[PDB]
């Protein structure tokens, strides 16, 4: 089976900085792309930046493009998602989205592997 | 002893065996894993019989990413945030992961920078689409960032264009409108390209020059370079090539002006506008190129072997094929280097119980080929003074299977009568056909447009070794391979050309799996180069050249009688090459007279007429060459300057007639139309006069 | 069936009747009589037993001076009053004054004009007077009429020297201390030139071009004709030649600035002042130009005539020479024109007695060289591609006789040895030798500087219809001829050249009495051609070749040497031009001995080596050719651009080393040296290929 | 024998022209040069134009450049001698020189057949 585990939550004021570390452990194809959907407490579910196995990326929040950044390492199966100067309205659940396709889109239907899911906070 | 003997001797288990051996690891051309199999080919060749095997080497300008520094495709908003980033490699094929050495896709020679700009889609970047923009759409891609798509035309005359029209960068992808046969899966459950597949290769204008930095000359150790800056044919702005799953992202947010028409619409989930910059929404974002790609010196090694002709050594037949490839070239160029392989194995077979050929027999494992032909083109520069006298025919074997349909022959007219005999002789592998010749087959599958019951033979271009034999020194060539449905599939090349996904897997189950036509391919190519260097007399037909330029002659002149008022005015005529024409004919069958009626056993007239036959060709060379292209001086079959791998035989006058309404005084147009008229005509004169009485 | 039959049917008597016959009216290219002479000429060589002959015709650009507006040079007052007229024409020579069509003095190819200003002596308008009169002198030759002496150089190179200073006109003489021979009396009562004689020749720089109007191809009837505008090599100003009876007038006055140094005076009683304008007494009177010539396109005719090959009828040895004169021609060319009529006539008696050359013979009485060797250059233009593939060699013969003191040859290297057998074969024509071979007489009067016991053979240079053959196509070439004692008299030429004065009688009195001497050169010639074509193994040797190319790689190099900091600072290096001559040394060496151990009677081994033989000498041609010179490609032995007619072997690197501390960018000039010195260095070692083992 | 017969004698006042021709008889040379020798009452001899065979003329009177000019005929075999805006100081007796070399010199010793001479009275 594959597990997304997420990790680096917190609850940091306004103009704080947080980083959101995840693996993908037992992935047994060759080839992915996952995805950190965010979803507001009071909203739907949309897409915020995507990377493929490819070494290809995106932000799909053009308004907030430079508070978020995606990096990966193959390495360590891991991808981390790094916040500039956070607002309160950031506060929100971040989900993995992990699918075989080296694509990237903004679909939550397109991926299948889900992970568990990451409560941020800002004051 | 006898031709049936080597075509019975060939196997497709051999064929099977070297294209494993040379597609597992890269071969990419100046590097080690290069080297180490130029090194085992002239251990095989020796050890199979060859007299001599040698590794001549140059020292030839490539171009190589740096690897600290990948390229990579960005689009920045207001402040350069880099948004989105282009993928730095494809997948690797499944079984290859572990396997080292694999360049990322790249356009080799592009030059460095870090250009900023809008996009602008010019469809396939060829002379009618910008013209459509500039002409009638009134766009200026000057200071723009210029798209295109892979197809109809070279990717060199894509950048060329592109750089007359101002613009700063070039990006080329494949679309699936082009490289995606329908109802056929990608290459790992099929053989149709991924997102991730890219095409690579040169974007080169060379014209026939081999090495950028010596025009003329072979590129040995005591060589003369110049600059850079004043090397032949380089691309001035970076270019850089993509998948299609890229090019979707890059022009979803494209906006602006419509699409001029729907051939310029792909099939990708696109808009295809053509406006410069995205919609409003994105209008401030731009798009930033990142190319760190640089070019060095390094060392080619090209194999020759050499099996010396018992009656006729100084006669060269070359079986020519080159070796380099991109990441593994499980078709491109290992088909063919494992048919030559086994050609050569039969060959030396036959030589270690007795047997050696007429003529003396040269083949050649060739390098640097995707780099601009530059090994072969190199190795000819510096032996041009032996070949011009001494090379019968050239036969080029690049990649073989190209599609599991029908042949397909690009050859010399003077070869037509031997790939028909030959041709004839041989068994057909496709269903059907069980039980037939392989003439009937290929007939049927593909009919000549323009006689009945003969086999479609097109002519022979450029873009291969034979470049440099043909259009230059002007030796007869000829390729045969096997191809596609002409008329169904209307897809350029194959799916996975030029792509990591071109692996073992991919030729053994989807192409061919069980090499019957990497065996009737490598009996073609064989049997071709065994009439030719051991017939008695030189199996070239001269009336078939004859039949072929009345009809190129009357192609070019309706061509020319399109602006009848412009060659009324300025007295433009044909009847110069009409005459030459019929000349050559009535020579011609003259010739075939004689040939007919001449005494084999007396060798010094036999040795008189083969040199008439082999002279012929050489015949149509022009020693000053076409006009700014000195390296292309064959006046019937040159490549033409604008509409090249489409253009018509007769280059000069061709080119010269080409938008010729357009031209600010056309009083010199049509005197250049009337030179190269003249020049036309006089050529085939002298090429007929050739075949005269011998005093 | 013997070549001694062949020498010894050569006789005096037949050249005496030769020469008288066509020495009696004019023959001027272009004209009725010329047509005449050419039909003459191919029904006796059709009488004679040729196999065929024909009449190859062009249609070439030619200069004629108006018969209603004579050319002179005068000279004008303040009013332009005219005072004094130069001469319209030369005094007949006696015998001749009821003869018509005798044409004015006149420098062919002259544009029209009435330019006037001040006169400037330039000595003999080469580019050190034009030095030493510019960056030592303080004096401008721009707007200024300049004036010069015949000699030392090429009309063309005054010319074009003239214009590059900037000069509106020239004015050649010949002077006294050049063409004067002391104690001979002038022409009416000995073989001197008297003051109204004047030299002819044209004025063209065409560097090998042919017909200035076709560059490139034959001027056939459907020719497409440039521009003369843009026309090659087209003089931009008036010339007009004189006698010293008319510059001793011109000079007279000439006042300012002494002359430089006793080399720029001459023999005239003038004092050769070089200062702009007369003196101060005359310094209002100037000097006026009236040219009036015109150029046209105009047919001229090459009789060609063809002996079968017995053995090898595709092997053609030519035996070359031109027909067209100025006034009568006595020796320029109809001395040599009858010693080609005589061989063919006993090339044809033995023809008749049953005997046929082993190959085959070309017989070319050209035309129109007078005019820039227009007619074989154009004949070679349209069978270039037949000369190219099988022109065993090539035998100028222009005007025979120079001076009764010695032999003089001019032949490629390949040609040395044969040319030494042959003389050995002959007699010595000379006093003091009767009973002797021409070979002891030859090398006792004309010894090597370099070697001892054998005879001195220069180079071969340009000028002449061998050019066309030799430095464009690659064919070996050589001339023999009697001329005068090379050290003690020190006069270029001989004092009637190309002078209405060239006579008959001159010819019978005072050069050849008994045409023992023109008999002499006949068995030369006739020999030469007759083991050429005749030899079963072509009678070439290459180890002459390597030795030439040796002294050739030492003196260039010492050249290069006279800057030995330049030299160290760009790195510039001859080791691959020395590497190049020693390898070509051995595979000479080794090739001979291949050639001295093979068996003659397998005729296709024997056609194997003919074969070698003669495309070594192709192997030295340059398909690119000399910078700026596209029809000059002999790597070796090319005229020199800067100082031609007195330059050295290797034009390219003499070329780029000359004048070479004067260039603003060294760097450039010392990276173009390197360029050739690459070039010349692969040429020789693609020449030494050549003669490798075959296969 | 060879005899130059003179002709045009006439004493016409300042400003008149007048034709001296003078023909040439029984030369049996092929080339011929010939001059015009002015000789004053008071002055010396000093030669004034010369013509050849060649059609090659001079005048040495620089002065008289305009005023005097020279043109000679091979068909009638003599040559005219026109005079322009003649002026008192012009009245003198002229000669014809005619020599074997076709060469123009102003030397009276070179020219050894020498013509009958003619008065010109100018008033
Ligand atoms: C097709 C067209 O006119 N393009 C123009 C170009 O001529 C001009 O040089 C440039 C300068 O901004 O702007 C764009
Ligand atoms: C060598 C030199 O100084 N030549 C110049 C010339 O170029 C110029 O035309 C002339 C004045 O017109 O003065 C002088
Ligand atoms: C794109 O690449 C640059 C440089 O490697 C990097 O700084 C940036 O974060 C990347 N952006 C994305 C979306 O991958
Ligand atoms: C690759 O880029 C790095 C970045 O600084 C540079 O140091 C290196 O020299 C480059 N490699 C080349 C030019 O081969
Ligand atoms: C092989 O032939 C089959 C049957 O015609 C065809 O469906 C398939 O596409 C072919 N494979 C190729 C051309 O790669
Ligand atoms: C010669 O000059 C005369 C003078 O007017 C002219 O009429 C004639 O055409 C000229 N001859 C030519 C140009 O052939
Ligand atoms: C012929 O030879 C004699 C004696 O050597 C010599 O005086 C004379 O000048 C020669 N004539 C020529 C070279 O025309
Ligand atoms: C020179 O020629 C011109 C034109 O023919 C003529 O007018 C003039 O009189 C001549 N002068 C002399 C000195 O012969
Ligand atoms: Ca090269
Ligand atoms: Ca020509
Ligand atoms: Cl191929
Ligand atoms: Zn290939
Ligand atoms: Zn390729
Ligand atoms: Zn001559
Ligand atoms: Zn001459």
Request: with cysteine.
């Amino acid at each position: 089976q594959v597990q997304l585990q997420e990790s680096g939550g917190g609850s940091v004021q306004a103009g704080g900085s947080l980083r959101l570390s995840c693996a993908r452990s037992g992935w047994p194809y060759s080839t992915y792309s996952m995805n950190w959907f965010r979803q507001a407490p009071g909203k739907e579910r949309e897409a915020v930046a995507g990377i493929s196995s490819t070494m290809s990326g995106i932000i799909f929040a053009e308004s907030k493009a430079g508070q978020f950044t995606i990096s990966q390492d193959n390495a360590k199966n891991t991808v981390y998602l790094q916040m500039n100067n956070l607002k309160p309205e950031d506060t929100a659940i971040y989900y993995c989205a992990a699918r075989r396709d080296y694509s990237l889109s903004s679909s939550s239907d397109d991926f299948d592997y889900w992970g568990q899911g990451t409560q941020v906070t800002v004051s | 002893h006898n031709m049936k003997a080597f075509l019975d001797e060939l196997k497709a288990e051999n064929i099977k065996k070297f294209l494993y051996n040379f597609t597992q690891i890269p071969h990419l051309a100046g590097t080690e894993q290069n080297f180490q199999l130029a090194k085992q080919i002239q251990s095989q060749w020796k050890e199979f019989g060859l007299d001599s095997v040698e590794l001549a080497h140059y020292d030839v300008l490539l171009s190589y990413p740096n690897k600290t520094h990948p390229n990579y495709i960005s689009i920045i908003n207001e402040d350069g945030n880099e948004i989105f980033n282009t993928s730095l490699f494809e997948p690797p094929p499944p079984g290859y992961e572990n396997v080292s050495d694999i360049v990322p896709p790249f356009s080799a020679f592009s030059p460095q920078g870090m250009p900023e700009g809008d996009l602008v889609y010019v469809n396939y970047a060829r002379t009618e689409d910008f013209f459509k923009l500039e002409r009638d759409m009134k766009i200026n891609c000057s200071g723009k960032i210029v798209i295109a798509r892979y197809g109809k035309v070279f990717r060199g005359n894509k950048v060329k264009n592109a750089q007359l029209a101002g613009a700063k960068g070039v990006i080329l992808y494949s679309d699936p409108a082009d490289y995606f046969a329908p109802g056929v899966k990608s290459y790992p459950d099929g053989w149709n390209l991924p997102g991730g597949g890219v095409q690579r290769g040169n974007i080169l204008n060379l014209n026939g020059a081999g090495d950028p930095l010596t025009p003329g000359y072979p590129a040995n150790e005591y060589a003369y370079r110049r600059g850079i800056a004043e090397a032949v044919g380089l691309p001035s702005i970076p270019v850089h090539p993509i998948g299609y799953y890229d090019a979707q992202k890059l022009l979803e947010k494209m906006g602006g002006s419509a699409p001029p028409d729907s051939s310029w619409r792909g099939s990708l989930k696109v808009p295809y506008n053509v406006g410069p910059g995205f919609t409003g929404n994105f209008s401030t974002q731009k798009v930033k190129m990142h190319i760190h790609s640089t070019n060095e010196v390094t060392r080619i090694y090209n194999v020759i072997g050499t099996l010396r002709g018992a009656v006729e050594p100084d006669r060269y037949v070359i079986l020519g094929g080159h070796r380099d490839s991109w990441v593994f070239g499980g078709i491109d160029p290992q088909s063919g280097a494992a048919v030559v392989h086994e050609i050569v194995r039969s060959f030396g077979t036959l030589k270690k119980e007795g047997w050696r050929p007429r003529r003396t027999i040269l083949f050649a494992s060739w390098d640097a080929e995707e780099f601009g032909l530059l090994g072969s083109t190199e190795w000819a520069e510096e032996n041009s003074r032996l070949l011009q006298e001494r090379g019968v025919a050239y036969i080029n074997a690049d990649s073989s299977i190209e599609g599991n349909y029908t042949l397909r022959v690009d050859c010399t007219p003077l070869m037509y009568s031997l790939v028909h005999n030959l041709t004839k002789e041989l068994k057909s592998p496709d269903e059907g056909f069980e039980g037939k010749s392989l003439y009937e087959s290929w007939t049927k599958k593909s009919p000549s447009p323009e006689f009945s019951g003969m086999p479609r033979i097109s002519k022979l271009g450029s873009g291969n070794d034979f470049e440099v034999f043909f259009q230059r020194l002007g030796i007869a060539s000829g390729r045969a391979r096997y191809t596609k449905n002409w008329e169904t599939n209307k897809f350029s090349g194959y799916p996975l050309y030029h792509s990591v996904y071109e692996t073992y897997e991919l030729v053994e189950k989807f192409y061919d799996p069980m090499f019957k036509y990497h065996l009737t391919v490598a009996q073609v190519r064989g049997g071709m180069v065994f009439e030719l260097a051991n017939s008695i007399v030189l199996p070239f037909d001269c009336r078939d050249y004859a039949v072929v330029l009345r009809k190129y002659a009357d192609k070019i002149y309706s061509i020319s009688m399109k602006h009848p008022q412009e060659m009324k005015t300025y007295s433009v005529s044909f009847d110069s090459l009409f005459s030459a024409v019929k000349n050559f004919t009535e020579i011609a069958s003259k010739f075939s007279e004689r040939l007919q009626d001449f005494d084999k056993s007396n060798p010094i007239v036999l040795r008189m007429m083969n040199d008439q036959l082999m002279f012929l060709e050489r015949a149509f060379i022009d020693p000053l060459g076409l006009p700014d292209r000195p390296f292309y001086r064959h006046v019937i079959y040159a490549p033409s300057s604008h509409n090249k791998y489409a253009g018509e035989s007769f280059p000069g006058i061709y080119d010269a007639l080409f938008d010729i309404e357009s031209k600010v005084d056309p009083s010199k147009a049509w005197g250049e139309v009337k030179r190269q008229i003249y020049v036309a005509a006089f050529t085939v004169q002298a090429a007929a006069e050739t075949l005269s009485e011998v005093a």
